[PDB]
From Swiss-Prot, chains A, B:
Molecular function GO terms recorded: adenylate cyclase activity; ATP binding; catalytic activity, acting on DNA; diadenylate cyclase activity; DNA binding; hydrolase activity
Cofactor(s) required for function per UniProt: Mg(2+)
Top-rank EC class of the record's enzyme: transferase
Protein name per its UniProtKB record: DNA integrity scanning protein DisA
UniProt family annotation: Belongs to the DisA family.
Function: Participates in a DNA-damage check-point. DisA forms globular foci that rapidly scan along the chromosomes searching for lesions.
Domain topic, free-text comment: Consists of three domains: an N-terminal globular domain with diadenylate-cyclase (DAC) activity, a central helical domain and a C-terminal DNA-binding domain.
PROSITE patterns: DAC (PS51794)
NCBIfam families to which the protein is assigned, alphabetical: PRK13482.1
Protein encoded by which gene: disA
Length: 349, 349
């Protein structure tokens, strides 16, 4: 959805004065045809009759004016009401796939002028926004909340399964018994979880102010998921991979590519044919995930540790003395690494 | 009202199936916009979307189709329904003094194509017919009947005073005591009476089949008034005058010229400037009225009788033998003339 169009959508999103007025118009079953222009004098060819108002905008004024037949003309920033009860006359030759005089008029005028035109039928509760060659149907909050609440509840389920796969993989990592199947399975669920987030995003935006709690819920649920997926990619990719490259891997599986077993294993650098082979491939974590998230060791410094010990397994066997031989690790970071790992092994395994 | 428009108005007059449908539409508060054209193909630029029907017309079909939004397209003779639910798009630059999309659309389309377009709003009970640059509002029968009934009542009153004036003029005429004032007063009342008929005529025409009784009443009330007035003009005009000149005099006072005492006397060939003078001008009827109406003597032959005697007074002093000295008058005409005058003088004076 183009950004130039997303900007216009904000104009009638829950929270704005304009939307408050449109909600009331809908509740009263009045119809509405609103034309947003900047220079009223320049549309004497498409705007006919009505009353010249040139007054300050307000939700109550718009509502009251919508009681009359015809269209209302507002300024682009919704600060002035220019005309009311006007007859809009766009070029009849302009193609339109709309039905009815009001919507056909709205699409034609928007295409002809490159301006925003809002239409509301008397019987229905949707707001149709036309801008240039675009058409966006805005829904009432109740419909949006139902979809968003369902999506969140769905996300909770995926997240619960992600957490179980993660704790299981954690045990396998600490014991160095991880297979490519385990890794890919965890990444797959992580990619599916973030995809759901991406798909509900437009619903959230459209909710405007009414989407505050929904946003907070999405944040609490998916907080550090992205980072976690990036660290897993770095820890299990066939060959050393830069963080940015890992983040790009993530972005691709979250939008373009499809998170299938073989496909994920393929992008990780493993030449696998059948998904049954995944259980056959053994892999050892580099150690980034634990070093950063648990030992609180910056990636730039974690590279150094991996460069020397190569795997988490070796890192877990290294003494403080051993660890201090690494650039960037003093008695403090050496203790943190050593202690955080020995603590997890004892508690988890 | 041009004969051209008059023909179209008949299409929606009480009695037609079309009008029957429009009345139902009005009674149901549905709206309507109807475009009459014989070759739809040629107007495909002003007719958009909708449903192609091409079916035989019926009042029930038109009524049902009017439940949908948009416009209906019928053949000019109203025998076929071509489209329903269409969007009519006439040129926006066409000037119009109408209000609302529906009526502004109808006027522009009518001007643009030179055809008939019918508009009916849901809120009102009138039918607006637009043809070319003409606009005729058709009213419901109830409104028309009320106007027509009051006009008829008014005519009865004028006719009564007319008969009172005529009866008194009859006495004076027989006694040869007529003054210009007597004649003028009678003519003025007769002229005023016929003007009312002319003014109410359009209402009766617009009443269609529901105006049958009204036409009968008008005819019974004004049956022989025109002839009577023409004969009065011929009998009292300054100098001899033909039936054609008289008939023209009548038409002038019923439309163009105002029937004022001085104006009537002036047109009769009398030089007067004050109404008071009228009671000072003694006049004598030629005899045409009595010869034609009572003696049943053809005007052509009446000219001969007046040629010889000049006035009714002299005609009543003639004998059968004397009267027969006129060409066209035999013992029969002579008897009818002589006996009819003598009988009236005995009964009226
Ligand atoms: N060119 C045309 N072709 C076919 N039918 C025509 C027509 N123009 C008017 N009408 C018929 O008249 C109905 C009501 O017209 P109205 O102006 O009261 O009530 C209108 C008007 O206030 C508004 N509206 C529609 N088009 C407009 C325009 N171009 N400019 C300003 N207001 C418009 O939306 C209301 C409802 O529109 P809707 O079509 O549902 O309802 C229409 C339609 O069935």
């Amino acid at each position: 959805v183009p950004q130039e169009l997303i900007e216009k959508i904000k104009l009638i999103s829950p929270g704005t004065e304009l939307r408050k007025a449109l909600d009331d118009i809908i509740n009263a079953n009045f119809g509405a045809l609103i034309f947003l222009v900047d220079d009223p004098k320049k549309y004497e060819d498409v705007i006919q009759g009505g009353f010249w108002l040139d007054t300050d905008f307000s939700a109550e004024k718009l509502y009251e004016l919508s009681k009359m037949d015809g269209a209302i003309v507002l300024s682009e920033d919704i600060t002035k009401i220019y005309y009311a009860n006007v007859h809009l006359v766009p070029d009849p030759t302009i193609p339109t796939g709309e039905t009815g005089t009001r919507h056909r008029t709205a699409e034609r005028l928007a295409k002809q002028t490159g301006k925003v035109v809002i239409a509301v039928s008397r019987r229905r509760n949707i707001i149709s926004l036309y801008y240039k060659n675009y058409k966006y149907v805005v829904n009432q909050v109740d419909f949006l909340i139902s979809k968003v609440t369902q999506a969140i509840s769905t996300l909770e389920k995926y997240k619960d399964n992600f957490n179980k796969l993660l704790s299981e993989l954690e045990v396998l990592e600490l014991e160095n018994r991880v297979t490519l199947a385990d890794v890919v399975r965890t990444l797959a669920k992580g990619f599916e979880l973030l995809r759901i987030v991406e798909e509900i995003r437009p619903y959230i935006v459209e909710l405007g102010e009414e989407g505050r709690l929904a946003r907070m819920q999405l944040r609490e649920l998916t907080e550090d998921v992205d980072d976690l997926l990036v660290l897993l990619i770095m820890d299990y990719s066939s060959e050393e991979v830069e963080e940015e490259t890992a983040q790009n891997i993530l972005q691709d599986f979250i939008t373009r590519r499809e998170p299938s077993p073989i496909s994920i294993s393929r992008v990780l650098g493993y030449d696998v044919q059948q998904a049954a082979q995944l259980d056959d491939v053994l892999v050892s974590a580099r150690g980034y995930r634990l070093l950063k998230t648990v030992a609180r060791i910056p990636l730039s410094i974690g590279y150094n540790v991996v460069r020397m010990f190569k795997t988490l397994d070796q890192i877990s066997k290294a003494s403080v003395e051993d660890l201090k031989k690494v650039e960037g690790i003093g008695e403090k970071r050496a203790r943190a690494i050593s202690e955080s790992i020995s603590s997890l092994k004892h508690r988890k395994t």
